[PDB]
Coordinates of C-alpha atoms and ligand atoms in Angstrom, one line a residue:
Chain A
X34 CA 0.0 0.0 0.0
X35 CA 1.9 3.1 -1.3
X36 CA -0.8 5.7 -2.0
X37 CA 1.4 8.8 -2.1
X38 CA -1.4 10.9 -0.6
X39 CA -0.7 9.2 2.8
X40 CA 2.8 10.6 3.4
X41 CA 2.3 14.2 2.4
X42 CA 3.0 16.6 5.3
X43 CA 1.2 17.1 8.5
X44 CA 2.6 20.5 9.4
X45 CA 5.5 22.9 9.5
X46 CA 7.2 21.8 12.7
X47 CA 5.8 24.8 14.4
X48 CA 2.2 23.8 14.2
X49 CA 3.4 20.4 15.4
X50 CA 5.0 22.1 18.4
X51 CA 1.9 24.1 19.1
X52 CA -0.2 20.9 18.8
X53 CA 2.0 19.0 21.3
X54 CA 1.9 21.9 23.7
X55 CA -1.9 22.3 23.5
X56 CA -2.2 18.5 23.9
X57 CA -0.2 18.6 27.1
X58 CA -2.2 21.6 28.3
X59 CA -5.5 19.7 27.5
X60 CA -4.2 16.6 29.2
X61 CA -3.2 18.5 32.3
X62 CA -6.6 20.4 32.4
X63 CA -8.5 17.2 31.9
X64 CA -6.5 15.4 34.7
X65 CA -7.0 18.3 37.1
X66 CA -10.7 18.5 36.3
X67 CA -11.0 14.7 36.9
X68 CA -9.4 15.1 40.3
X69 CA -11.7 18.0 41.0
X70 CA -14.8 16.0 39.9
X71 CA -13.7 13.0 42.0
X72 CA -13.3 15.4 45.0
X73 CA -16.7 16.9 44.3
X74 CA -18.4 13.5 44.0
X75 CA -16.8 12.6 47.4
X76 CA -17.9 15.8 49.1
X77 CA -20.3 17.9 47.1
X78 CA -22.8 17.0 44.3
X79 CA -21.4 16.1 40.9
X80 CA -23.0 15.1 37.7
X81 CA -22.0 12.1 35.6
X82 CA -22.0 14.1 32.4
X83 CA -19.0 16.3 33.2
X84 CA -17.1 13.4 34.6
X85 CA -17.8 11.2 31.5
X86 CA -16.9 14.0 29.1
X87 CA -13.7 14.8 31.0
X88 CA -12.6 11.1 31.1
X89 CA -13.3 10.7 27.4
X90 CA -11.4 13.9 26.7
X91 CA -8.4 12.8 28.7
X92 CA -8.3 9.4 26.9
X93 CA -8.7 11.1 23.6
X94 CA -5.9 13.6 24.4
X95 CA -3.5 10.8 25.5
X96 CA -4.2 8.9 22.3
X97 CA -3.8 12.1 20.2
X98 CA -0.4 12.8 21.7
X99 CA 0.7 9.2 21.3
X100 CA -0.9 7.6 18.2
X101 CA -2.8 10.4 16.4
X102 CA -1.4 9.4 13.0
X103 CA -1.7 5.6 13.6
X104 CA -4.4 3.5 12.0
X105 CA -7.1 3.5 14.7
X106 CA -7.0 7.2 15.1
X107 CA -6.0 8.1 11.5
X108 CA -7.7 6.2 8.7
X109 CA -5.6 6.6 5.6
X110 CA -8.1 5.5 3.0
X111 CA -7.6 4.3 -0.6
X112 CA -8.6 7.9 -1.7
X113 CA -5.4 9.3 -0.2
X114 CA -7.3 11.2 2.5
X115 CA -6.1 10.8 6.1
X116 CA -9.3 10.7 8.1
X117 CA -9.1 11.7 11.8
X118 CA -11.3 8.9 13.1
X119 CA -10.3 9.7 16.7
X120 CA -11.9 13.1 16.4
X121 CA -15.3 11.8 15.2
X122 CA -15.3 8.9 17.6
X123 CA -14.7 11.3 20.4
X124 CA -17.4 13.6 19.1
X125 CA -19.9 10.7 19.0
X126 CA -18.8 9.8 22.6
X127 CA -18.9 13.3 24.1
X128 CA -21.3 15.6 22.1
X129 CA -24.4 13.5 22.9
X130 CA -23.4 13.5 26.5
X131 CA -22.9 17.3 26.3
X132 CA -26.4 17.6 25.0
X133 CA -27.7 15.3 27.7
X134 CA -26.1 17.8 30.1
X135 CA -27.7 20.7 28.1
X136 CA -31.0 19.1 28.8
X137 CA -31.5 19.2 32.6
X138 CA -29.1 22.1 33.1
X139 CA -30.2 22.2 36.7
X140 CA -29.2 18.7 37.8
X141 CA -32.6 18.2 39.5
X142 CA -35.1 16.9 36.9
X143 CA -35.0 13.1 36.6
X144 CA -36.9 12.9 33.3
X145 CA -36.1 14.1 29.8
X146 CA -38.5 15.4 27.2
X147 CA -38.8 14.5 23.5
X148 CA -36.9 17.6 22.6
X149 CA -33.8 16.0 24.2
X150 CA -34.5 12.9 22.0
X151 CA -34.6 15.0 18.9
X152 CA -31.4 16.9 20.0
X153 CA -29.5 13.6 20.4
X154 CA -30.8 12.1 17.2
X155 CA -29.9 15.3 15.3
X156 CA -26.4 15.4 16.9
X157 CA -25.7 11.8 16.2
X158 CA -26.8 12.3 12.6
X159 CA -24.7 15.4 12.2
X160 CA -21.6 13.7 13.5
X161 CA -22.3 10.7 11.3
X162 CA -22.6 13.0 8.2
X163 CA -19.5 14.9 9.2
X164 CA -17.5 11.7 9.4
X165 CA -18.9 10.5 6.1
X166 CA -18.0 13.8 4.5
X167 CA -14.5 13.5 5.9
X168 CA -14.2 10.1 4.2
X169 CA -16.3 10.9 1.1
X170 CA -13.7 12.7 -1.0
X171 CA -15.5 14.9 -3.6
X172 CA -19.0 15.9 -4.5
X173 CA -20.2 13.2 -2.1
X174 CA -18.1 15.0 0.5
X175 CA -20.1 18.2 -0.3
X176 CA -23.4 16.4 -0.2
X177 CA -22.7 14.8 3.2
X178 CA -21.4 18.1 4.5
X179 CA -24.7 19.7 3.5
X180 CA -26.6 16.8 5.2
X181 CA -24.5 17.4 8.3
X182 CA -25.2 21.1 8.0
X183 CA -29.0 20.5 8.0
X184 CA -28.7 18.1 10.9
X185 CA -26.5 20.5 12.8
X186 CA -29.0 23.3 12.1
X187 CA -31.7 21.2 13.7
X188 CA -29.3 20.5 16.6
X189 CA -28.5 24.2 17.0
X190 CA -32.2 25.1 17.0
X191 CA -33.0 22.6 19.6
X192 CA -29.9 23.5 21.6
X193 CA -30.9 27.2 21.5
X194 CA -34.4 26.2 22.7
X195 CA -32.8 24.2 25.6
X196 CA -30.5 27.1 26.5
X197 CA -33.4 29.6 26.6
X198 CA -35.4 27.1 28.7
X199 CA -32.4 26.7 31.1
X200 CA -31.9 30.4 31.2
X201 CA -35.5 30.9 32.3
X202 CA -35.8 28.0 34.8
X203 CA -32.4 28.8 36.5
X204 CA -32.5 31.2 39.4
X205 CA -31.9 34.9 38.7
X206 CA -28.3 36.1 39.4
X207 CA -25.0 34.3 39.0
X208 CA -26.9 31.2 37.6
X209 CA -28.2 33.0 34.5
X210 CA -24.7 34.6 33.8
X211 CA -23.3 31.1 34.0
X212 CA -26.0 29.9 31.6
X213 CA -25.2 32.7 29.2
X214 CA -21.5 31.9 29.3
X215 CA -22.3 28.2 28.7
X216 CA -24.4 29.2 25.7
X217 CA -21.7 31.4 24.3
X218 CA -19.0 28.7 24.7
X219 CA -21.3 26.0 23.3
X220 CA -22.4 28.0 20.2
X221 CA -18.9 29.4 19.4
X222 CA -17.1 26.1 19.7
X223 CA -19.8 24.0 18.0
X224 CA -19.9 26.5 15.1
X225 CA -16.2 26.4 14.8
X226 CA -16.4 22.6 14.4
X227 CA -17.8 23.0 10.8
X228 CA -15.5 26.0 10.2
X229 CA -12.5 23.8 11.2
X230 CA -13.9 21.0 9.0
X231 CA -14.1 23.4 6.0
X232 CA -10.6 24.8 6.7
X233 CA -9.0 21.5 7.6
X234 CA -7.7 18.8 5.4
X235 CA -11.2 17.1 5.4
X236 CA -12.4 20.1 3.4
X237 CA -10.3 22.8 1.7
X238 CA -6.7 22.0 2.6
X239 CA -5.8 25.2 4.2
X240 CA -5.2 24.3 7.9
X241 CA -3.1 21.1 7.4
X242 CA -3.2 18.2 9.9
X243 CA -1.3 19.9 12.7
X244 CA -3.0 23.3 12.4
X245 CA -6.4 21.5 12.3
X246 CA -5.3 19.6 15.4
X247 CA -4.3 22.8 17.1
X248 CA -7.7 24.5 16.4
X249 CA -9.6 21.4 17.4
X250 CA -7.7 21.1 20.6
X251 CA -8.5 24.7 21.5
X252 CA -12.2 24.4 20.7
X253 CA -12.2 21.0 22.4
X254 CA -10.9 22.6 25.6
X255 CA -13.6 25.2 25.1
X256 CA -16.5 22.9 24.3
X257 CA -15.9 20.1 26.7
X258 CA -13.5 21.0 29.6
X259 CA -14.5 24.7 30.1
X260 CA -18.2 24.1 29.2
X261 CA -18.3 21.1 31.5
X262 CA -16.7 23.1 34.3
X263 CA -19.2 25.8 33.8
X264 CA -22.1 23.3 33.9
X265 CA -20.7 21.9 37.1
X266 CA -20.5 25.4 38.6
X267 CA -24.1 26.0 37.5
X268 CA -25.1 22.7 39.3
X269 CA -23.2 23.8 42.4
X270 CA -24.9 27.2 42.4
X271 CA -28.3 25.5 42.0
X272 CA -27.6 23.1 44.8
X273 CA -26.6 26.0 47.0
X274 CA -29.9 27.8 46.1
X275 CA -31.9 24.7 46.9
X276 CA -30.1 24.4 50.2
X277 CA -30.7 28.0 51.2
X278 CA -34.1 28.9 49.6
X279 CA -35.5 25.7 48.2
Chain B
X34 CA -2.6 3.4 -4.1
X35 CA -2.3 -0.3 -4.8
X36 CA -2.6 -2.1 -1.4
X37 CA -3.3 -5.6 -2.7
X38 CA -5.5 -6.3 0.3
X39 CA -8.2 -4.1 -1.3
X40 CA -9.0 -6.2 -4.4
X41 CA -9.1 -9.7 -2.7
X42 CA -12.6 -11.2 -3.2
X43 CA -15.9 -10.2 -1.8
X44 CA -17.8 -13.5 -2.4
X45 CA -18.4 -16.6 -4.5
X46 CA -20.9 -15.2 -6.9
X47 CA -23.6 -17.1 -5.0
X48 CA -23.3 -15.1 -1.8
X49 CA -23.3 -12.0 -4.1
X50 CA -26.6 -13.2 -5.6
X51 CA -28.1 -13.9 -2.2
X52 CA -27.0 -10.4 -1.0
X53 CA -28.6 -8.7 -4.0
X54 CA -31.8 -10.7 -3.6
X55 CA -31.9 -9.9 0.1
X56 CA -31.2 -6.2 -0.6
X57 CA -34.1 -6.1 -3.0
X58 CA -36.3 -7.8 -0.4
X59 CA -35.2 -5.3 2.2
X60 CA -35.8 -2.4 -0.1
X61 CA -39.3 -3.6 -1.0
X62 CA -40.1 -4.3 2.7
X63 CA -38.8 -0.8 3.7
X64 CA -40.7 0.9 0.9
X65 CA -44.0 -0.9 1.8
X66 CA -43.5 -0.2 5.5
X67 CA -42.9 3.5 4.6
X68 CA -46.2 3.6 2.7
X69 CA -47.9 1.9 5.6
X70 CA -46.5 4.3 8.1
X71 CA -47.5 7.3 5.9
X72 CA -51.0 5.9 5.7
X73 CA -51.0 5.4 9.5
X74 CA -49.8 8.9 10.2
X75 CA -52.6 10.1 7.9
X76 CA -55.4 8.0 9.5
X77 CA -54.2 6.3 12.8
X78 CA -51.5 7.1 15.3
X79 CA -47.9 6.5 14.3
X80 CA -44.6 7.1 16.0
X81 CA -41.6 9.0 14.6
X82 CA -39.2 6.2 15.6
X83 CA -40.4 3.5 13.3
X84 CA -40.7 6.0 10.4
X85 CA -37.2 7.3 10.9
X86 CA -35.7 3.8 11.2
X87 CA -37.5 2.7 8.1
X88 CA -36.4 5.7 6.1
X89 CA -32.8 5.3 7.2
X90 CA -33.0 1.5 6.4
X91 CA -34.4 2.2 2.9
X92 CA -31.7 4.8 2.2
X93 CA -29.0 2.4 3.5
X94 CA -30.4 -0.5 1.4
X95 CA -30.4 1.6 -1.7
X96 CA -26.8 2.7 -1.1
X97 CA -25.8 -0.9 -0.3
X98 CA -27.2 -2.2 -3.6
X99 CA -25.6 0.6 -5.6
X100 CA -22.3 1.8 -3.9
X101 CA -21.6 -0.7 -1.1
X102 CA -18.0 -1.2 -2.2
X103 CA -17.4 2.5 -3.0
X104 CA -15.4 4.8 -0.8
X105 CA -18.1 6.5 1.4
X106 CA -19.7 3.1 2.2
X107 CA -16.5 1.0 2.1
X108 CA -13.3 2.5 3.5
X109 CA -10.4 0.6 2.1
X110 CA -7.7 1.7 4.6
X111 CA -3.9 1.6 4.5
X112 CA -4.0 -1.6 6.5
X113 CA -5.7 -3.5 3.7
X114 CA -9.0 -3.9 5.6
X115 CA -12.2 -2.9 3.8
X116 CA -14.3 -1.3 6.5
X117 CA -18.1 -1.2 5.9
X118 CA -18.6 2.4 7.1
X119 CA -22.2 2.4 5.8
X120 CA -23.0 -0.4 8.3
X121 CA -21.7 1.5 11.3
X122 CA -23.1 4.8 10.2
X123 CA -26.5 3.3 9.8
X124 CA -26.1 1.6 13.2
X125 CA -25.3 5.0 14.7
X126 CA -28.4 6.5 12.9
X127 CA -30.9 3.7 13.8
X128 CA -29.9 1.8 17.0
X129 CA -30.1 5.0 19.2
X130 CA -33.6 5.6 17.7
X131 CA -34.5 1.9 18.3
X132 CA -33.5 2.3 21.9
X133 CA -35.5 5.6 22.1
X134 CA -38.4 3.5 20.9
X135 CA -37.5 0.8 23.5
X136 CA -38.0 3.5 26.1
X137 CA -41.6 4.6 26.0
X138 CA -42.8 1.3 24.4
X139 CA -46.3 2.6 24.9
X140 CA -46.3 5.8 22.9
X141 CA -47.9 7.7 25.7
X142 CA -45.2 9.0 28.1
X143 CA -43.7 12.3 27.0
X144 CA -40.7 12.1 29.3
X145 CA -37.7 9.9 29.3
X146 CA -35.8 8.7 32.4
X147 CA -32.0 8.7 33.0
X148 CA -32.0 4.9 32.2
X149 CA -32.8 5.9 28.6
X150 CA -29.9 8.3 28.8
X151 CA -27.5 5.6 29.9
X152 CA -29.0 3.2 27.3
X153 CA -28.2 5.7 24.5
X154 CA -24.7 6.6 25.8
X155 CA -23.8 2.9 26.1
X156 CA -25.2 2.1 22.6
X157 CA -23.4 5.0 21.0
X158 CA -20.2 3.9 22.8
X159 CA -20.6 0.3 21.7
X160 CA -21.2 1.3 18.0
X161 CA -18.1 3.6 18.2
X162 CA -16.0 0.8 19.6
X163 CA -17.3 -1.7 17.0
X164 CA -16.4 0.7 14.2
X165 CA -12.9 1.3 15.8
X166 CA -12.4 -2.4 16.1
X167 CA -13.4 -2.8 12.4
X168 CA -10.7 -0.2 11.5
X169 CA -8.2 -1.2 14.2
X170 CA -6.5 -4.3 12.5
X171 CA -4.9 -6.4 15.3
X172 CA -4.6 -6.5 19.0
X173 CA -6.0 -3.0 19.0
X174 CA -9.0 -4.6 17.2
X175 CA -9.3 -7.1 20.0
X176 CA -9.1 -4.3 22.7
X177 CA -11.7 -2.2 21.0
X178 CA -13.9 -5.2 20.5
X179 CA -13.7 -6.0 24.2
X180 CA -14.5 -2.3 24.9
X181 CA -17.5 -2.6 22.7
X182 CA -18.5 -5.9 24.4
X183 CA -18.5 -4.1 27.8
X184 CA -20.5 -1.2 26.4
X185 CA -22.9 -3.6 24.7
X186 CA -23.2 -5.6 27.9
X187 CA -24.3 -2.4 29.7
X188 CA -26.6 -1.7 26.8
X189 CA -28.1 -5.2 26.9
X190 CA -28.7 -4.9 30.7
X191 CA -30.4 -1.6 30.3
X192 CA -32.5 -2.9 27.4
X193 CA -33.5 -5.9 29.4
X194 CA -34.6 -3.7 32.2
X195 CA -36.6 -1.5 29.7
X196 CA -38.2 -4.6 28.2
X197 CA -39.2 -5.9 31.6
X198 CA -40.7 -2.5 32.5
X199 CA -42.5 -2.4 29.2
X200 CA -43.8 -5.9 29.6
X201 CA -45.2 -4.9 33.0
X202 CA -46.7 -1.5 32.1
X203 CA -48.3 -2.8 28.9
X204 CA -51.9 -4.2 29.2
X205 CA -52.3 -7.9 29.7
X206 CA -53.1 -9.9 26.6
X207 CA -51.9 -9.4 23.0
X208 CA -49.7 -6.4 24.1
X209 CA -47.4 -8.5 26.3
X210 CA -47.1 -11.2 23.6
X211 CA -46.0 -8.4 21.2
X212 CA -43.6 -7.1 23.9
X213 CA -42.1 -10.6 24.3
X214 CA -41.7 -11.0 20.5
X215 CA -40.1 -7.6 20.3
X216 CA -37.7 -8.6 23.1
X217 CA -36.9 -11.9 21.3
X218 CA -36.2 -10.1 18.0
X219 CA -34.2 -7.4 19.6
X220 CA -31.9 -9.6 21.7
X221 CA -31.4 -12.2 19.0
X222 CA -30.5 -9.7 16.3
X223 CA -28.5 -7.4 18.5
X224 CA -26.5 -10.5 19.8
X225 CA -25.9 -11.6 16.2
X226 CA -24.4 -8.2 15.5
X227 CA -21.2 -9.1 17.4
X228 CA -21.4 -12.7 16.2
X229 CA -21.4 -11.4 12.6
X230 CA -18.6 -9.0 13.5
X231 CA -16.5 -12.0 14.8
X232 CA -17.4 -14.1 11.8
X233 CA -17.1 -11.3 9.2
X234 CA -14.0 -9.9 7.6
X235 CA -13.8 -7.3 10.4
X236 CA -13.0 -10.2 12.7
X237 CA -12.0 -13.7 11.7
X238 CA -12.3 -13.9 7.9
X239 CA -14.9 -16.7 7.7
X240 CA -18.0 -15.0 6.3
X241 CA -16.4 -12.9 3.5
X242 CA -17.9 -9.5 2.5
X243 CA -20.9 -10.9 0.6
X244 CA -21.8 -13.5 3.3
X245 CA -21.4 -10.9 6.0
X246 CA -23.7 -8.6 3.9
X247 CA -26.2 -11.4 3.6
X248 CA -26.3 -12.0 7.4
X249 CA -26.4 -8.3 8.2
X250 CA -29.2 -7.8 5.8
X251 CA -31.2 -10.6 7.4
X252 CA -30.7 -9.4 10.9
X253 CA -31.2 -5.8 9.7
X254 CA -34.6 -6.8 8.5
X255 CA -35.2 -8.5 11.9
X256 CA -33.9 -5.7 14.1
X257 CA -35.3 -2.7 12.3
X258 CA -38.1 -3.5 9.9
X259 CA -39.8 -6.4 11.8
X260 CA -39.0 -4.9 15.2
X261 CA -40.3 -1.5 14.2
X262 CA -43.4 -3.0 12.7
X263 CA -44.0 -4.9 16.0
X264 CA -43.5 -1.7 17.9
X265 CA -46.0 0.0 15.7
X266 CA -48.5 -2.8 16.3
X267 CA -47.9 -2.5 20.1
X268 CA -48.6 1.2 19.9
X269 CA -51.7 0.5 17.8
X270 CA -53.0 -2.0 20.4
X271 CA -52.2 0.4 23.2
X272 CA -54.1 3.2 21.4
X273 CA -57.1 0.9 21.0
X274 CA -57.0 -0.1 24.7
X275 CA -56.9 3.6 25.7
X276 CA -59.8 4.3 23.3
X277 CA -61.9 1.4 24.8
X278 CA -60.9 1.2 28.4
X279 CA -58.7 4.2 29.2
Ligands
L9Q301 C1 -20.8 18.8 16.5 C2 -20.2 18.0 15.3 C3 -19.8 18.9 14.2 C4 -19.9 18.2 12.8 C5 -19.0 19.0 11.8 C6 -19.7 18.9 10.4 C7 -21.2 19.1 10.5 C8 -21.6 20.6 10.2 C9 -22.8 21.0 11.1 C10 -22.4 21.4 12.5 C11 -23.2 22.6 13.0 C12 -23.9 23.3 11.8 C13 -24.8 24.4 12.2 C14 -24.9 25.5 11.2 C15 -26.3 26.1 11.0 C16 -26.8 26.8 12.3 C17 -28.0 27.7 12.1 C18 -29.0 27.5 13.2 O1 -29.7 26.6 13.3 O2 -29.0 28.6 14.2 C19 -29.8 28.2 15.4 C20 -29.1 28.6 16.6 O3 -27.7 28.4 16.6 C21 -26.7 29.5 16.6 O4 -25.6 29.3 16.6 C22 -27.2 30.9 16.5 C23 -27.1 31.6 17.9 C24 -28.4 32.1 18.4 C25 -28.8 31.3 19.7 C26 -28.1 32.0 20.8 C27 -29.0 32.5 21.9 C28 -30.1 31.4 22.2 C29 -29.7 30.7 23.4 C30 -29.0 31.6 24.5 C31 -29.6 31.4 25.8 C32 -29.2 32.6 26.8 C33 -30.2 33.7 26.7 C34 -31.6 33.2 26.6 C35 -32.6 34.4 26.7 C36 -31.9 35.7 27.0 C37 -32.8 36.7 27.4 C38 -34.2 36.2 27.4 C39 -31.2 28.8 15.3 O5 -31.8 28.7 16.6 P1 -32.8 29.9 17.1 O6 -31.9 31.0 17.6 O7 -33.8 30.1 16.0 O8 -33.5 29.2 18.4 C40 -34.8 29.6 18.8 C41 -34.7 31.0 19.4 N1 -35.4 31.9 18.5
L9Q302 C1 -25.5 -2.7 18.2 C2 -24.1 -2.5 17.7 C3 -23.3 -3.8 17.7 C4 -21.8 -3.6 17.8 C5 -21.0 -4.8 17.4 C6 -19.7 -4.9 18.1 C7 -19.9 -4.6 19.6 C8 -20.1 -5.8 20.4 C9 -21.1 -5.7 21.5 C10 -22.6 -5.8 21.1 C11 -23.5 -6.5 22.1 C12 -22.6 -7.1 23.1 C13 -23.4 -7.8 24.2 C14 -22.8 -9.2 24.6 C15 -22.8 -9.4 26.1 C16 -24.2 -9.0 26.7 C17 -24.7 -10.0 27.8 C18 -25.6 -9.3 28.7 O1 -25.3 -8.2 29.2 O2 -26.9 -9.8 29.1 C19 -27.8 -8.8 29.6 C20 -29.1 -8.9 28.9 O3 -29.5 -10.2 28.7 C21 -30.0 -10.8 27.5 O4 -29.3 -10.6 26.5 C22 -31.3 -11.4 27.4 C23 -32.2 -10.8 28.4 C24 -33.4 -11.8 28.7 C25 -34.7 -11.1 28.5 C26 -35.1 -10.2 29.6 C27 -35.8 -9.0 29.1 C28 -37.0 -9.4 28.2 C29 -38.3 -9.2 29.0 C30 -39.5 -9.2 28.1 C31 -40.4 -10.4 28.5 C32 -39.9 -11.1 29.7 C33 -41.0 -11.1 30.8 C34 -40.7 -10.0 31.9 C35 -41.2 -10.5 33.3 C36 -42.0 -11.7 33.1 C37 -42.9 -11.9 34.3 C38 -42.2 -11.8 35.6 C39 -28.0 -9.1 31.1 O5 -29.2 -8.4 31.5 P1 -30.2 -9.0 32.5 O6 -30.9 -10.2 31.8 O7 -29.4 -9.3 33.8 O8 -31.2 -7.8 32.8 C40 -31.9 -7.7 34.1 C41 -32.9 -8.9 34.2 N1 -32.5 -9.7 35.4

């Protein structure tokens, strides 16, 4: 198997250095957040969503530092396109959990509405179509990217509805500022996901593998570590409000 | 890109014929079920889960008859392993919806418990690990298959709990026989999914591409078309019971 499109070049030895540094920073942040969540589960209240997302992010970052360009994480394909399977697998593992966290922002409701079901179905669909577009190499890539755009538009509409509902159910004060910050982080990072797809090697080859890895690491820290930490803080504030007033 | 493991052989020209015949049968069954579900949505009650699963199955069967060995549906990989991406993408699209149907068997409850959330997370994880094992080529394949086995064991435990809960909430009579048949179909087909993985080219190369396609088509008809039709019949019986008694 030669396929000269496999060797190519992943970066410029400076994007590689930035990617390694950001991977170390993400690993450290995920590890520290995991110890913090373990301590909180021991003492305070803690949700399973943030812990699961942090654990998956830590595992993904370790595998990205070690074997990002190896077969399970990087599919090389007969078309000459190196597909970052690790990215989309981690998306499938985390983003549904992030939206399960988005529903029931206040970690108090035990049940989930059908809007959550539509959210999850649309998100799984949009990640599936994004992966297929990454592996689709051509006009099929454009078709599957547009399918993912439609699914992600539905996902964004449902997520915006969930964010408005959370903003209104949450107590007035610090809680709504935390909800607004969560919404900002969520929408910016989840809208940079398709932007990075377009700019990355999976779309127009502008960002290269290492630059795309750098950008995806940054918005991965934003969308999962920082967003999960803000969700945990929102849950802590809600628990305090329930203890005092409720 | 030569990679002599890509050409190989997909079947014996009889497994190919059986695969084509079963694809035509699945396409016809999905089309007829789609007209039936459209008629039911027009006249009777009909759930979105069965319609969505049938539509995805019809699209998947069309793409399997036409471009099953083409790049978007078949990733060829630098390792020489032809990965059936269409299979795992369709799994990610349907199986979560099948489990959303498994929760709320009686199409009456608007809310979903955290057990449904765990079901969906475990199922997405098990499909992700199955895809990674299909692309992982070696001891990494075994490791990811075992990870998928753990996730699918959790999924099966939660699905069994959901089936017992549905069997007990459903009215006594035809409804519980339909629930039992749904449970039998679900567990047999979803347990043949890893059996077919083991026997297929993604595991031990015993079934070949065409034989694996034949088996997956059969248990795809069982797990999605027949199971969805039985779920629709259960919902129809429950609606009749509500109309008469409830
Ligand atoms: C994740 C995997 C990525 C895969 C990569 C490849 C796939 C490509 C697709 C990925 C994503 C593609 C999406 C692009 C299309 C998005 C267009 C879209 O649907 O836009 C969505 C929203 O998404 C956005 O990003 C636009 C931002 C607007 C929403 C921000 C505020 C709402 C929530 C904030 C709550 C805090 C304040 C609440 C009240 C404040 C005071 C009362 C439209 O809602 P909506 O707006 O109509 O809501 C109902 C409300 N009228
Ligand atoms: C889908 C994508 C496939 C990916 C392929 C590669 C990934 C490989 C993994 C895929 C699947 C891997 C699973 C293999 C290992 C799973 C074994 C396992 O976990 O087994 C699970 C599930 O067991 C079964 O598979 C069969 C369940 C028996 C039926 C029970 C529910 C039906 C109820 C309906 C009618 C019954 C009447 C109810 C009451 C009657 C009156 C009292 C253990 O629950 P459980 O049994 O302890 O429950 C709690 C009950 N005590």
